[PDB]
């Protein structure tokens, strides 16, 4: 990484619908690299989410991404023998990756008796503002405006 | 129609091709029809033994066995042709299977 900016892979778009956000989502939800089962789980969860919400799946996913996408993040630094938290803005691509990846790693952890339904129901909870994603958004913002005053370092 | 399989099957590229050229020339001035040295899967043996005794096994070396095999499918097995065939003297590199 020292030598310069590494080239970025040209990720392919989802052909079933037309949004590459699904491709990134299946890449994140990959468990030991079994894409066939992973993507069929993703599509089944999206179908049951459609059945639950009665609206457009792509519109719901875009709404969830808009609701849980960040703008500021907190980084750690040690100066003079003491560690401090400094906030720095993030690029929208990084923001989307964090939003979807927090969505999935929180959908991993409910007790709804089955995680194929947990995926869709966390999607719904992020959409309506009652999810683990949105509560982490509240916590991260609380930490952000708690430590905005350290922005003078600008690192 | 009788087919006899002339096998030029050994290790090394240079000597095996020398033998193949000699066999092709023998067929040429003997008057027979032969396809020639058709490519065949060469056997590749890999053996791993540790380069140092008494531990120090993280660094090693590999060895290779390239077993080169040629097929010479002769047509019209003339008795004089086959006589010249086993009267040819070949170097120790190549082994012939007259089948």
């Amino acid at each position: 990484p020292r030598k310069g900016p590494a080239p970025k892979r040209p990720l392919v778009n989802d052909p079933v619908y037309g949004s590459q956000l699904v491709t990134q989502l299946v890449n994140k939800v990959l468990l030991e690299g079994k894409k066939s089962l992973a993507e069929r789980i993703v599509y089944g969860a999206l179908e049951q989410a459609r059945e639950k919400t009665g609206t457009d799946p792509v519109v719901t996913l875009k709404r969830a991404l808009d609701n849980v996408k960040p703008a500021l993040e907190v980084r750690s630094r040690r100066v003079g023998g003491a560690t401090y938290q400094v906030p720095v803005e993030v690029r929208p691509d990084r923001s989307t990756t964090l939003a979807l990846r927090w969505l999935v790693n929180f959908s991993r952890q409910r007790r709804e008796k089955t995680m194929v339904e947990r995926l869709a129901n966390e999607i719904l909870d992020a959409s309506n503002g009652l999810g683990a994603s949105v509560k982490r958004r509240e916590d991260t913002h609380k930490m952000a405006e708690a430590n905005r005053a350290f922005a003078h370092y600008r690192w | 129609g009788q087919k006899i399989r002339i096998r030029l099957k050994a290790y090394d590229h240079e000597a095996i091709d020398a033998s193949a050229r000699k066999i092709v020339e023998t067929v040429t001035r003997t008057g027979a029809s032969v396809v020639g040295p058709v490519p065949l899967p060469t056997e590749k043996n890999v053996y791993c033994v540790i380069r140092s005794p008494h531990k120090y096994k993280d660094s090693r070396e590999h060895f290779e066995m390239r077993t080169h095999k040629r097929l010479i499918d002769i047509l019209d097995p003339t008795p004089k042709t086959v006589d010249a065939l086993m009267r040819i003297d070949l170097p120790a590199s190549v082994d012939v299977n007259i089948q």
């Binding site: - | 290790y11 890999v46 060895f63």
Partner: protein, 60 residues
Amino acid sequence: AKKALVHKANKKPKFAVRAYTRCNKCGRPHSVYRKFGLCRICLREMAHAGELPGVQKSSW
């Protein structure tokens, strides 16, 4: 490799179960390869000297 042990292994034993390899050059009971009949150290030194017909560095 004690020479008495090597020679005792060389003689035909009372039962076929008592036969192992005992590399000819050095009598090493362990770390042997059959198709050559040589142990690791002997195989390596012979290969480096070029006296065994064929074994060579491989890379792929």
